[PDB]
Amino acid sequence: AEQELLAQPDAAYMDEAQQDFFRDLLLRQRQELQARIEGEFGELRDLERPSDEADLASREEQRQWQLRLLEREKKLLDKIDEALERLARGDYGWCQETGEPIGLRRLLLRPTATLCIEAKERQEKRERH
Template sequence: MTEEELLQQPEDAYMNEEQKAYFNRLLHQQREELQNHIDSAVEALSQYESSSDPADMGSMEEQRQSHLRMLEREKKLLAKIDHALHLLALDEYGWCEQTGEPIGLPRLLLRPTATLSIEAKERQERLDKHQRKD
């Protein structure tokens, strides 16, 4: 099934077996690509050499810290992908964790790890923004 075919299905076909299989393949593919990238980044981090020049040491440390931050973000994404795959196994994938409403195919295609509908996510962001102001 292609993305276009997925979007052309009727609303009452939401999260049918074909759609779940599509997202299962998509999530597994993204997981594999991300895991390969994490593995190569960890390998690259282990290749950093020490230098006696303070300027080189500072530059290398800055690059290393940047790589570590990127790795941390990617590991969080990996956990989200694993959570999405777990939801798929439970037949709960594609449904908003707050409202129980469909998240929607367009949103899931853009962010396969989404667990909230657009409305619930906007509400959460407004609440977070309000709490940060206080």
């Protein structure tokens, strides 16, 4: 895998190559998410289909569930679009609190992540109080 290949470079963290890698990843996820949203939309235009009196009860509260997913989903898209821009500005891959590098492994599992590990530990530790 290119993942294998990538997880072998060194203090070349976020060079033109490494960046080009994640731009690919993100865009793929973007198109995937985009098309999945389009799904949950028509999946909604199926509860807008002519309603009946009896099935009205559950069908409404089912539409209620959809709208929250469709909402989570729609936001996730922006999260990606934001990271895709971070890449353009050349601010990608770096921890926002401390300019420190965000793990390459880390970024692989969540390309969308904005903090490095220890920053997250410290932010979760504040949350505890």
